[PDB]
Amino acid sequence: MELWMVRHGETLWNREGRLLGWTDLPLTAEGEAQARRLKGALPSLPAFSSDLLRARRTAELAGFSPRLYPELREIHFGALEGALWETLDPRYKEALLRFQGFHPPGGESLSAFQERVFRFLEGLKAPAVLFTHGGVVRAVLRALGEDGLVPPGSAVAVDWPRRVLVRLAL
Ligand SMILES: [Cl-]
């Protein structure tokens, strides 16, 4: 199944290196511009979006009218929401870099997070554009053997559950 995964545009925390999960931060001005540049650049397929503001806004600016679904949310960082990456306890940093064995206090375990994400992908019947978050895009790419590092406001197409098709960074 062809699936376009769009990482929402820049927020102040994506810029200052602060963990951003369920905190409902808005896109920066540049983040909004990144979203606007996607309009007309992505296939006009049916759209689905995380319910968090920044994701919904990116969809809107990119010319879409997505159905809001919480399963597309970034992982919940719990007590570590907004936590500065610099001073993040080495154990969390390591776990987050390896993308495994990470369960932020009060947040979701990486296992529960990836389960709701892949469960959502399994429920899709026809190709679509998913306006989501960095951790979601990363989970998908990692499962596919490839790096899950794309920049904010960018999109990557994947033929789930097989491989990556194209990476769009404008
Ligand atoms: Cl993100």
Automatic annotation (TrEMBL):
- What is any one of the record's Gene Ontology cellular component terms? cytoplasm
* Name of this chain's protein: Alpha-ribazole-5'-phosphate phosphatase
Q: Which GO terms describe its molecular function?
A: phosphatase activity
Per UniProt, substrate binds at 7-14, 54
**Membrane-crossing residues?**
none
Entry-linked Gene3D superfamilies: Phosphoglycerate mutase-like
Q: Which UniProt keywords apply?
A: Glycolysis, Isomerase, Plasmid
Looking at the record's lineage, which domain of life comes first?
Bacteria
